Amino acid sequence: GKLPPGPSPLPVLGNLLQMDRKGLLRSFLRLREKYGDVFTVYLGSRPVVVLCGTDAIREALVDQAEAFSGRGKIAVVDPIFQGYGVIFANGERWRALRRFSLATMRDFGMGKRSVEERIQEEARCLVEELRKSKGALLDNTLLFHSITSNIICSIVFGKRFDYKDPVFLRLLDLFFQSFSLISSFSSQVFELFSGFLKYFPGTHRQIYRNLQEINTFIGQSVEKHRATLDPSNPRDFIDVYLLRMEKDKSDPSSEFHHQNLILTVLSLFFAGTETTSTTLRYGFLLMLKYPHVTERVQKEIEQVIGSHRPPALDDRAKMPYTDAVIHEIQRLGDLIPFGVPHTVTKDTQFRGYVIPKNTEVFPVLSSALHDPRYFETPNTFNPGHFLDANGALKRNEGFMPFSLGKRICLGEGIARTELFLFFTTILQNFSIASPVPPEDIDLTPRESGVGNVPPSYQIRFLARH
């Protein structure tokens, strides 16, 4: 019962504790080189198994899906962490989230328009909004944040907001705008001894100002909903949930309920949506750099959709190249380098070694996204990574931006639809330009850490007509 090959732990300080993305990337390439695709690294009295590349990951997530279906444990004591962390600490709860979203999506087509439809509409308002700029230089960051969020809003709150609407413009900041944290060793030391640091450790100071403001909007939205709830005609996710806890009314569990709800929506709302908004953004940075490929995309749109018909989810199958560009964008955007960690639910043999129950495993997705065994030019934008001999779309075995297995992204589908419609629509209507020349656009992600996010950039949308 030996774990896989690995380096030597350093006691309670950290052999490699505190390294930065670049330093670790260097360390990671070495470890993988020293031990292979499956190695063990030791941290704070615990071993985490690291899976590298297409094969190792697939052997784990897919060939032994259940064994690896455990989600990384989260152990801390706080107020905020306790109440919420618990709600989703269990693996069963995660399943419950899926089980509800799929069934609800199936049985309750809520509001005279399907998902693909609400996205075709949002794109339509985007094209309407993009003209209101009249060819100026703006930052897609907020726009792309708006459109992708509106979708989650529609499906959950039963409506979409207008890009200028304050209730929306402000909610967008609550979730997506970054807050700088200012501290100094001096101040930190003072806080620790007399700081009541146990009370506002790290980021709590900031979150609570958003958390309270958010818990408010939801809380009051749930309320406006519950009062107009036609039990024969639900309108959105919230109604369909209200109808469920109408039995549990006359109990104080409602406070527990409402809280259950808030995170689910935020977790659903921000992590998926933010990732999608970033993917789009990154997508257009690429589009600027490689104008050649941007043209083909446009030319193809023209041969299948034309200049007037709004693009639909059915064109994706008749547009192999544009679909290939979107795969590449996801492969290179690579927003989740290490990927959410797993925990193996039982004593699991793996390539001969033995990973004990609850041994946290890291499926490094980036190592697959860039896996040389599966991509001709692993670090170069190349739509050919996904096109067969006859210019048709072949699947690449190493393409897993949404991870794999039982634990795959609950929004993988809804996301890819957003990506294709938003992309083809924008490009069917507008032409893109930037101050920077393509050959000087740097794609290198600003990498504060824990995720790839592209550098800021201006962009110009020109209506072809």
Ligand X SMILES: *C(=O)Cc1ccc(C(C)(C)C)cc1
Ligand Y SMILES: OC[C@H]1O[C@H](O[C@H]2[C@H](O)[C@@H](O)[C@H](OCCCCCC3CCCCC3)O[C@@H]2CO)[C@H](O)[C@@H](O)[C@@H]1O
Ligand Z SMILES: OC[C@H]1O[C@@](CO)(O[C@H]2O[C@H](CO)[C@@H](O)[C@H](O)[C@H]2O)[C@@H](O)[C@@H]1O
- 337 binds ligand HEM per the rule CB under 6 A: no
Closest CA to 146 of 128, 129, 169: 169
Choice between 88 and 381, CB closer to ligand Y: 88
Contact track, ligand X, 297-336, x by CB under 6 A: ---------------------------------------x
Residue 105 partner contact from ligand Y, ligand Z, ligand HEM, none using kind-dependent CB cut-offs of 5 to 8 Å: ligand Y
Tell me which amino acid residue 7 is. Answer: P
Q: Shortest Cβ distance from residue 179 to ligand Y (Å)?
A: 26
According to CB under 6 A, which residues from 103 to 142 bind ligand Y?
Answer: 105-106
d(CA 280, CA 140): 9
- CA–CA dist 340, 271 (Å, integer): 12
Annotate each residue in 62-101 with x if it binds ligand HEM (CB under 6 A) or - if it does not, as one string: ---------x----------------------x--xx---
β-pairing verdict for 459-463 and 46-52: unpaired
438 secondary structure, DSSP code: G
Any known ligand binding at 153?
no
Please say whether the beta carbons of 276 and 148 come within 8 A.
Answer: yes
How do beta strands 46-52 and 360-364 pair?
A: parallel
b/e 398-410 (16+ beta carbons within 10 angstroms → b)? bbbbbbbbbbbbb
| CA separation, residue 129 to residues 126, 162, 255, 450 (Å) | 5, 10, 39, 33
C-alpha to C-alpha distance for 337 and 307, rounded to whole angstroms: 38
Minimum distance of ligand X from residue 336's CB (angstroms) = 6
Binding piece for ligand HEM, criterion CB under 6 A, among 31-39, 205-213, 255-263, 402-410: 402-410
Residue closer to ligand Z by CB (options 412, 447) is 412
Nearest distance in Å: CB 206, ligand Y: 24
Contact with ligand X (CB under 6 A) among 70, 158, 234, 272 = 272
Residues at the site binding ligand Z, with contacts judged by CB under 6 A:
316, 323, 393, 395, 402, 412
Binder to ligand HEM among 409, 426, 427, 459 (CB under 6 A)? Answer: 409
Map residue 93 onto helix, strand or coil: helix
Q: Which of 265, 280, 286, 409 binds ligand Y (CB under 6 A)?
A: 265
Binding-site residue set for heme? 409
